[PDB]
Design a protein around this nucleic acid. Structure first.
Length: 121
RNA sequence: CUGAGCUCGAAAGAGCAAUGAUG
């Protein structure tokens, strides 16, 4: 486990976020890679943000949790950049992803957003 | 900013790329 995990995770919650990224992909609005993830926040209203637990250097995503406390935005880690990339519809690894519109996945974002907001306290 | 594309020979497939191709 890296230095920037602000909370620990079972096999669940991070796998439910992985299949949330799939369902938003064509049915809603998704943005790809850590720069587009960072833009998604600063343009004022992301819906959620996803990060890979296996990043090296780890310091390159360390600006996302702080930025997510300034913007009141909820976030969650998933087991690898290579399975995050696959979920996002691409074949290169992705250190992070952002949700602009959940599509079909509105109520799937809502039930995990609520649980993120408690395991963060 | 855009945000996925690019490099090559043949009968072919490998490599680069969201840790950023194109512009």
């Amino acid at each position: 486990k890296p230095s920037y995990v602000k909370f620990e995770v079972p096999k669940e919650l991070a796998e439910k976020a992985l299949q949330a990224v799939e369902i938003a992909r064509d049915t809603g609005k998704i943005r790809k890679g850590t720069n587009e993830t960072t833009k998604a926040v600063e343009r004022g209203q992301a819906k959620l943000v996803i990060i890979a637990e296996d990043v090296d250097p780890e310091e390159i995503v360390a600006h996302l949790p702080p930025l997510c406390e300034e913007k009141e935005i909820p976030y969650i880690y998933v087991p690898s950049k290579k399975e995050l990339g696959a979920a996002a519809g691409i074949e290169v690894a992705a250190a992070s992803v952002a949700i602009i519109e959940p599509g079909k996945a509105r109520d799937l974002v809502e039930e995990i957003a609520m649980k993120v907001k408690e395991l963060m306290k």
